[model samples]
Target: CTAGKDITCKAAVAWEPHKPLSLETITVAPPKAHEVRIKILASGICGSDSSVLKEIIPSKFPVILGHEAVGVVESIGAGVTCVKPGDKVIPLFVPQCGSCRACKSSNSNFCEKNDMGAKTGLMADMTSRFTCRGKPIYNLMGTSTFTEYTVVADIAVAKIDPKAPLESCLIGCGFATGYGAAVNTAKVTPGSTCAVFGLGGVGFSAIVGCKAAGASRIIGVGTHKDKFPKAIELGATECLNPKDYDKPIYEVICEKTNGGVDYAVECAGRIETMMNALQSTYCGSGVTVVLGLASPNERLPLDPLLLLTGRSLKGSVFGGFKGEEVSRLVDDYMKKKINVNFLVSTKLTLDQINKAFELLSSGQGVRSIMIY
Candidate 1:
């Protein structure tokens, strides 16, 4: 490789939507100011990444994919202080610029500086540090860890204990997203009945959260019966497969629970499931949250009467978590207060990233952790 500025490496890249990734060599530039360069050690294939790859999440072409990754710092840009070379870190898809209004208030995760949605796929500075065959390529979610090395803004990197295995850091995405959905967003009350739609990583993580929060009974809803075993192990007291019932899911849930579950979470990315999550909740004061990434052109319709009667609907992004707050969560993981590793169902290699997508599509496992 040329000394300094441009480095050549292999990365699994999405060249087109609804297509398999192409493993190709690309140039990743040196870190600019306030940015850090990292060599990824472990990464997990998240639902959002898979959806974006399949065109369901709608993103620009030729973008480097994969988020919810863990790595170690190799270099840093000028004016950086949070971490140094060799520090283990997790990049934030929803970055927290500490002084922003959203960051300073009670709400800390919805940082206004987050630009992961920008069509250009560059960092906050609006420039590209990546190129394929001399053509400018884009970064995905600010920290494109689909490659062996990546560049990320300092504000988005969460430094952590170097001792914990990076493979367990899979909690950065689906696990924590669901865990936070129940704990923070729903504020699951002890001894209350709960329901979670979808049994993928996020939904399974939600069950763990609900149990940790002291929920009396937890219902796991999914399309496949195979997901039921792990759901039960994770804390779900009941499991329901919509295909097994002739009645609509909402009616079945409400009738079975005698007027609806006390709290409900939707993690399937389906409008029907979202609506059912709301409809199946105990009407007044019951809370429901949307935890899935909906496809383009889908809408969540809210009824005034639904809220007027005391039911409410909300959303959780990155499990309502901030970058600075994750190390403590890891402590919880280490203490066994939460079960992070239980969701680890498959291990993958960089070359097998496409197989990760197939596993996610089949809903055959909780999560697949890919190592370098």
Candidate 2:
């Protein structure tokens, strides 16, 4: 056994919905087969992380709650060749094997082999390598990187250039999710019009994606006026404060687009935004993309008549990129072909995780990253 000190680390764990996360020390075991021990350098506080706090999605209890992270490979299990020790890598929330049917086709984001509930832990073989008080703890999303050190599957690790800041790459999930929603999923064409509801980290990334995709007019809708300037800086052509409009915000969106936006993205995760994104899309000529995760039991009321008007509504998870595609998207951002920096608003320490969640929930920061 490769013995080490009882590492005193801080991680945010969820015991119940809408409750404060419990900060505790967790003991990490060395890598086993197809597993790699990672000394996490940076982890991003994603909206999904916030959602998990509110029980928006059903997840295992006493689970370490974080998904987007970049780390250095500390150790590798036997027969692990995908990544070696000392490799600078990012942990993808979803694992994609290139040969899988979903990866073999153009859509690698929906890899069929990613076992979430079945595996229950970071190990690829459906067992956990972490313990606290000698009892096994559940791993969230197969990459509970909120801890200082954690074990993850070889497939979840994506080796990147060491020169790049892990802090910046930590935004891979939020940035890539929003960017890919516009550029890949919605395929927002040049001269198209788009409206993004909510100006948080993901919303801001969606705005940049619209600009990158050459949208003629990009409208940002938010209740807060403070986020408008940053939204404009990130390429929003117009900013609308929902509070100023007495009429439904969707009607205001229609007014801005002369009829309705060609593409609408819902990033707020509110039932209202979900409906707004759908109603903001032009009849028979637009597409509404729901990018946020609402509460687990929350359901959206949709008008069947709108579907008959030729407006299409769809849902996206993990920005529609699976497996190695995350690495490719990060490369594009590094090369300046895609601008992700505009959305990275702040950075915090691993211990400051609770405060970070407060900022995210209050809409005070775009993206708050935690550096170990």
Candidate 3:
């Protein structure tokens, strides 16, 4: 893997929809102003990447996949100030420029730069630095770390503790997202009844966060009864198999919890699950935070009357965290206050990248990481 412009580097390129990524050499152009080049050390395969591969997220072909990366800053474009060469950093799908409207107010963490460049298959500047066999390869959600080397916006770079292991980079998306959804977004209170839908990486981590917030009973919901073990291991007080009930899951939850839970989080990325999370919450002051990206055309329909009871529903991305704040969340992991590493189910090198996706697609593992 080469670092400079016009040099070739190995990457698992997604050539077409519903296909395996081909390991090939891609050309990475040097960074422009406000950008930086990184030599990726480790990357976590996320469910969202599966959406892109399936074309649910609307991606371009021959794209380099994989977000959730941690690496060292190898080079920077002019005017970059947050980091310098040799700094350990996490690449953010959601950038933090610190000057955008989202970054300026309490309703922050969602930055303008973060939203740019994903679908266009280019950077915020409307161009890409990657090419394969003389043809351009698009990117995935701004930071494509499945590759050996890549360039990203300076705002997308979060400088971290130098000692941070690449394995912890999974915090960049999965763990921090669910953790923040519980602690920051829903603000789960001590001894409160909370329910987390789905028991995947995000769902399990949400349980951890709920427990960290002092919730007494954390109920985990899933189709697979086997997932209950992992959910309970991660602070879930009890687990429910949604399929066990013939009636609607929300109704089952309402009956068992006596009018629903105090807080509910949806991490399954299914509209039905989203509705379940909402309807399973306690009617008065029940809060539901949605943390998954449903299919592009999918919509969650609700009874407007449901809101009449003071119930609320909200969405959380990247765990309601800004770029630099993610660094602080990792610090929580460093201190042993948060334990997302326990959710890592499989580890493989970049060469075994396709199997990683298979695990995610089948929902058989908590997480599969690429050790570069």
Candidate 4:
């Protein structure tokens, strides 16, 4: 077994329900069989993490929260071959081991290997290695990277170039999730018209995807007027404040697009935004992608007549991307074909995580990375 002396690391922990993330120091164990120990360089506070922090999503107690992060492999367990010590890697919320049937299929996003929650929790054999005061702590979304050091399976980590800035790569999830929603799930094409409701990290990335896809007109809808400038910088052609219009926003969108937009994405968590996207699509030819994670009990109302118009609605989680597909997207960014730096609003240390969350919840900008 490996040896170390009480390796104390800091993390943002949620002990009880309905509270802010508290900083706590915890000890980390060495890697076990098929596990890898990562020294996290940076971590992202995703929308999912905020939900977890607010207890909107039920989670195991004393859990470490974080999903997207870039780190360096400090050690590997026996039989591990995908990555070695000192390799730069990004931990995915979903792991993709290529041999699984889902991986073999075109849709690796639903990899069968990840069907077992135990394996995805980064346990060596359905057991956790992270503990606080000798009590076991549960992992979050198969990744507990909010801490300084974390243990994950080989399948969960994707090796990237050492030269790439960890801060830039930290946006992999934010960018990939939103971009793939437009290009992969909705397949918005050249000369197409698109409407994206919400100009947050994910929605802004969807706007960039629309522009890159050659969409003739891109409409960004947001509650605040201040976010419109940043949305335009990210490739939105038009910005609309939902409250300002007397007529229905969908009617306005339809009038502007000469019928309706070819594609629409709803990134706002509100049910009204979902309805807006659904009604803003062209009849018989439009596709609406649901990118928002609504509350468990919330219901989205749909008109029966609208369904008969040939408009299709679909839900996408994590942008319909598997772990390997995300790795490839990282390479695309490294090659400079896709820009990720546009979304990075601030870089903070682990101690500044609370402030980061405050800014993120305010919905004023894109990502705020926590540097370890």
Candidate 5:
């Protein structure tokens, strides 16, 4: 009945940095041209969400801070032909405007029209569809999933298999980002040894990807010892706790794998971890793929000598997979070929979103899914 009309819904609004999110009723307007409105079924709390709250990512205030979710299309605007009402979909922060240079290129998935580059917190027309108590609410990375209902640009939505579970929301960001970092960006080879730094949802997904890529040895590295068992369960041949080692962790890794691993994936957003990831790989012929989102001001103090050899340093966003690939990942999940359920360590209602943030901040769990 509210196809083209405004609908009232619940949302978690972050009014400022370093503050808890407030649950409030907000109005979601109908989608404009080239837009799609979605009813978010489930959303996963990602580390970047927490980073935004802490101002680590430098986002606008009074915004919805979620980018990972699975939803069903409730309505579509004029000229929106990719998906229609009743279609299950995943909201994409890294939009795929098929006509853009990056989109048209064969080796890149970073779209030219993505909001992530500038963090405008608005649609292409520079306006938001949400309003809470008469104040405009900013969108997060074009696809704000912190609300019961949200609007996204046509280029930023991907239709997925209807059989996908709500928990499959991980595919929207964490799963795809980590998993693709290994398979697509790193291109892990068969019988090769790999090292995945971090044990969060994305790091674990990287481990799974390495396993799927036929890597003979997968090492999981993290500061948290509690996540080691799960990492091992997810195809990690062995786990390393940086805290347990008196020497440099990279030295330990290099010692374990002869001359360092063939591929090194850094999921921890720390500069040290990124450097260690590069150093943990074989200097002569190794690749290190970074999937972490460090602060805006943090620059990698790159030593020219690091890449002097045949060693390569690469960064991947959304696992270097286009938004169109999201549906295929969903299919993989539905067919039992991938495991997203194991990454969900906790499930909570939207009202408990703050708890989810705490879980992410404290590193108490792998991931928390908020069921709408």
Candidate 6:
């Protein structure tokens, strides 16, 4: 049995920023106590992964860079009871260690055990489970899933329906982030007007969320006119090209809606986009939820009058769902209540990983899933 033994497999390794990943033969160590080793079935490339590669986001080099993925448990560590071998699971970057302060709070899900901050790129024990040519490789977001196999902490994994399809990996991050941005954070009301900034996968999913929440008119905001058709199909009543207007786009939106949209969600990781999203909402009783990950050095300058006008600006990660709640999202997918297929513009093998990054940088595609 391979339960307690190291397994050698192929993995895409990011040697440094501004370079393509190198597919290398690596050894995946057995899971430690309270950890679960998984055999990856599919992994979705996220914008953060691209950012990490482009040096826009801070990350360690020679690391595995993927957080959205679906896999099957190959083995479990000592004292692990959350899941067992053969169970289908999704790794959690923002884990829900039930006892953590954020997890204990009713209105928060930013568990203290999460890797969102500090980004040590190592397991809980400060060591890695992956090695290449005798050098230890780091893990990203506590769930380095770009590899064929990975080990994650028990609290950072959720067991889902065994019948879930490979595409369900999107639920682990993108779909959940966007959908939850509207349903959980913004709490969009029925018949309200919503504006979603950015027409990428996450932005499209935000439109899907607004539609599900009964928004009468959902506006998709983006510079690319080519993605407008899909955005319209995904419940955006109409799409707007900011380039068409010489003046500020938010001003155009404010005029069209008589005041502004009831909710404005930002999925574009740009300072200007964040400011635009905040300004695109009604001066009174408007909610803006930002789901984008901007550069590490970037900052948003806000005027106090913006909040004094009864406007609300919030940030959400992983859709404010606990690690355990992700399974229900998978169930929703299985019932066809949510469609992730449209969000995936292309699929590639692990060996073609660099092309996925190219597509992301070019903005030619929405998402690319690496099928193992």
Instruction: Return the clash pairs for model 3, or none.
Output: none
TM values, all candidates: 0.96, 0.93, 0.96, 0.93, 0.98, 0.98
User: lDDT scores for all predictions?
Assistant: 0.85, 0.78, 0.85, 0.80, 0.92, 0.91
Clash number for model 3? Answer: 0
For residues 201-273, could you state the per-residue lDDT of candidate 3 as single tens digits? 8888899999999998899998778777777878888888877878998888888888999999999888889
* Alpha-carbon lDDT of model 6: 0.91
Poorest lDDT segment (10 consecutive residues) of candidate 1: 1-10
Worst lDDT 10-window in candidate 5? 356-365
Which structure is stronger by lDDT: 1 or 2? Answer: 1
Model 6: weakest 10-residue lDDT segment is 358-367
Q: Which whole-number lDDT from 0 to 100 does residue 298 have in model 3?
A: 83
Question: Measured by TM-score, how close is model 1 to the native structure?
Answer: 0.96
Relative to the unseen true structure, what is the C-alpha lDDT of residue 137 in candidate 5, on a scale of 0 to 100? 93
After superposition on all CA atoms, what RMSD does each candidate show versus the true structure? 1.6, 2.2, 1.7, 2.3, 0.9, 0.9
Error of 5 at 207 (Å): 0.5
Best by lDDT: 5
Question: Which structure is stronger by TM-score: 1 or 5?
Answer: 5
Q: lDDT tens string, model 2, 180-227?
A: 788877889999999998888778888888999999999998988888
Error of 2 at 228 (Å): 0.4
- The C-alpha local distance difference test score for the whole of candidate 2 amounts to 0.78
* Candidate 4, position 199, lDDT: 81
Native-to-model Cα distance after best TM-score fit, residue 331 in candidate 4, in Å: 2.8
Query: Model 3 off-target regions past 4 Å?
Result: 1-5, 116-118
Give per-residue CA lDDT, model 6, range 1-372, as digits (tens).
789999999999998988889999999999999999999999999988888888888888789999999999999999999898999999998988899789889889999988878989999899999999999999998998899999999999999999999999998898899999999999999999999999877898899999999999999999889999889988999999999989999999999998999999999889999999999999998899998878878889989899998999999898887787898899888898988887889999999988888887778667889899
Off by over 4 Å in 6: none
